[PDB]
Amino acid sequence: MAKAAAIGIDLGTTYSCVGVFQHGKVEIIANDQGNRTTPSYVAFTDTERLIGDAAKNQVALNPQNTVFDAKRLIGRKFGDPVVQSDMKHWPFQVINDGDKPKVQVSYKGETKAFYPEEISSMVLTKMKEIAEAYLGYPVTNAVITVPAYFNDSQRQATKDAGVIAGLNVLRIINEPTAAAIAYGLDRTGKGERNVLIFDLGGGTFDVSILTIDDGIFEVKATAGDTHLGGEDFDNRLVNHFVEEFKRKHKKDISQNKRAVRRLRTACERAKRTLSSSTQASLEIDSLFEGIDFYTSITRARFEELCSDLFRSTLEPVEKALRDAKLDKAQIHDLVLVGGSTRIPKVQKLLQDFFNGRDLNKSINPDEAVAYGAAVQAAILIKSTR
Ligand SMILES: Nc1ncnc2c1nc(Cl)n2[C@@H]1O[C@H](CO)[C@@H](O)[C@H]1O
């Protein structure tokens, strides 16, 4: 029953996803709000602890006690230059506890401090409860994914987050490996298969090259930009609309925190519409000083606004190919991962770089990693019996 059941968890930097393989198919499990992905946010309030959508929804009201980006801290030392650099951009406090970072917050009127693995365990607990509500029984066996460049310390702290959450961690697998499993790329029989995984998420960009020789996976190269993602595209739309508001009304809105956040959430929504329509409308009632902001934007203007950012995704693709010592024609498969790969211009740039090649994109790119993890968790739990 429960002991023969296993889930697949994509524990992402900005969003997490949970899947289950049963009756010959993967089911990506929707949360209580009906969303197939859940924000990796934990809010500490005067009365409760919020996880996911509810935590993301009150981030503007409570920025000092809303934790996110815990994956950027997990398995790292406080003195690490990555930690020191990132700390300057977060609204929550990061403290040093014997060269280990802890996030310090106000919770139910008291000062509390948590290890990154304790924060990630709260996200994992929510993913586990989303699966339990769907299945009708508690599921404890799980496959948890990590980026291919995570070292032993980061992998061990992710497994510890799984233990704190009440999960029996069957295996910690690489995100690009879970994505290649989702597309059944390890079941093509004999001969080495070269796979490129193009992963463009909310806050990070990763390119991975794998060789699959008789079911065995090998990471040949990893490249990317840890500070490039969907949120940089939203911010480009934000700057455009701030300049448009200034031209129409001769008023600068940039200093009004509420106006910028309402514009930001509307921009993110409009960006998603632009992936399936050639125009999107913004409808913001009383944006600033009682002025409604009812406008539109073409996909052509959006592509111009982000042009340099889209083009920059091809430098790590080239870097990964040189590190892997492979030419373009030596890559058998191209796999898309991350919500931002739905952007038509991104797909066109990648397809043209690979000389008009077909892309593996039929599985929802923000769900492909959880999908593969769910497949692996089913195989692993069957072998355990
Ligand atoms: N339809 C879409 N068109 C463009 N961007 C999208 C889309 N869906 C998601 Cl999710 N994202 C973005 O992906 C990230 C999460 O993986 C977020 O930045 C989200 O906006």
Side-chain angles (χ1 to χ4, degrees), residues 1-24 26-32 34-60 62-76 78-99 101-186 188-189 191-213 215 217-245 248-249 252-256 259-260 262-324 326-381 383-385:
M1 177 228 276
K3 63 157 77 169
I7 61 175
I9 303 162
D10 163 32
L11 179 64
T13 302
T14 75
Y15 281 93
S16 295
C17 186
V18 60
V20 69
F21 180 88
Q22 52 179 20
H23 319 295
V26 173
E27 170 79 13
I28 293 297
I29 306 156
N31 62 23
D32 61 41
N35 303 306
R36 287 154 76 91
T37 66
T38 297
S40 303
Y41 280 64
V42 183
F44 299 90
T45 86
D46 64 320
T47 57
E48 57 190 330
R49 196 189 68 188
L50 305 166
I51 312 168
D53 285 297
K56 179 137 174 191
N57 293 339
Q58 57 77 85
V59 73
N62 185 34
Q64 297 176 291
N65 308 304
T66 305
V67 186
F68 60 90
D69 276 355
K71 184 167 178 179
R72 295 190 184 274
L73 285 174
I74 208 159
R76 288 180 195 275
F78 181 83
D80 189 326
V82 167
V83 176
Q84 289 309 305
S85 166
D86 286 336
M87 275 172 62
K88 305 193 205 298
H89 302 292
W90 293 317
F92 47 84
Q93 266 297 294
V94 177
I95 59 152
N96 182 6
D97 191 355
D99 202 18
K102 284 194 95 170
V103 179
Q104 193 176 257
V105 295
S106 191
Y107 179 47
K108 291 171 164 194
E110 282 176 327
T111 302
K112 296 280 184 219
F114 302 89
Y115 286 114
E117 53 264 48
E118 297 179 293
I119 295 296
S120 290
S121 85
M122 298 172 191
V123 176
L124 289 169
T125 296
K126 179 62 137 178
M127 301 320 287
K128 180 188 97 188
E129 299 167 335
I130 283 159
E132 179 191 347
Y134 173 74
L135 292 167
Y137 52 82
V139 48
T140 232
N141 297 296
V143 161
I144 304 160
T145 63
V146 291
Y149 58 83
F150 261 24
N151 63 21
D152 285 332
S153 175
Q154 292 168 297
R155 288 169 198 270
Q156 186 76 186
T158 301
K159 184 261 296 143
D160 293 336
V163 174
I164 300 163
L167 292 163
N168 173 43
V169 185
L170 298 168
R171 200 176 276 171
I172 290 293
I173 78 175
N174 294 327
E175 287 162 21
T177 296
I181 292 164
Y183 281 99
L185 298 178
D186 62 312
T188 79
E192 316 201 80
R193 194 147 188 94
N194 302 129
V195 183
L196 187 144
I197 300 84
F198 187 99
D199 191 0
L200 186 59
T204 61
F205 171 56
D206 294 296
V207 174
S208 301
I209 299 176
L210 310 182
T211 295
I212 312 158
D213 194 359
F217 283 89
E218 187 191 330
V219 182
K220 293 280 193 74
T222 59
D225 189 336
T226 63
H227 299 77
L228 178 68
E231 78 166 50
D232 303 304
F233 317 145
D234 302 333
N235 291 335
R236 288 286 178 90
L237 283 170
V238 161
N239 302 320
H240 163 77
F241 287 123
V242 164
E243 184 62 45
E244 183 183 295
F245 197 92
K248 292 170 164 177
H249 310 289
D252 190 13
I253 71 160
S254 61
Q255 297 312 103
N256 196 281
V260 177
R262 281 180 80 212
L263 183 60
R264 194 176 288 114
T265 69
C267 285
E268 190 267 348
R269 296 173 202 283
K271 169 193 75 173
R272 295 192 279 131
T273 300
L274 293 176
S275 290
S276 56
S277 297
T278 63
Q279 70 155 52
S281 288
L282 251 72
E283 309 160 296
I284 316 159
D285 285 349
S286 182
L287 176 59
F288 184 83
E289 295 185 347
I291 313 157
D292 297 342
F293 198 45
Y294 276 64
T295 186
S296 60
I297 191 163
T298 62
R299 177 190 289 178
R301 175 61 172 154
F302 169 66
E303 289 166 351
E304 188 185 45
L305 285 171
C306 306
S307 176
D308 55 305
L309 299 178
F310 298 156
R311 283 167 53 178
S312 79
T313 72
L314 299 180
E315 160 45 26
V317 173
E318 193 171 297
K319 217 256 187 196
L321 289 165
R322 303 186 310 259
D323 293 351
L326 292 169
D327 278 9
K328 294 163 179 195
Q330 295 193 265
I331 297 293
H332 306 269
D333 318 294
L334 301 176
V335 180
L336 297 183
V337 177
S340 306
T341 62
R342 283 182 175 119
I343 297 162
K345 189 60 176 176
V346 172
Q347 294 184 10
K348 193 203 188 295
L349 282 161
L350 185 65
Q351 175 175 75
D352 298 346
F353 180 84
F354 278 100
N355 323 104
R357 209 83 76 76
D358 286 329
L359 307 172
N360 284 291
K361 60 173 187 167
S362 59
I363 298 165
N364 292 332
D366 49 8
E367 297 168 13
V369 173
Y371 189 116
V375 171
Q376 197 59 42
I379 296 164
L380 288 177
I381 199 62
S383 62
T384 288
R385 289 115 63 238

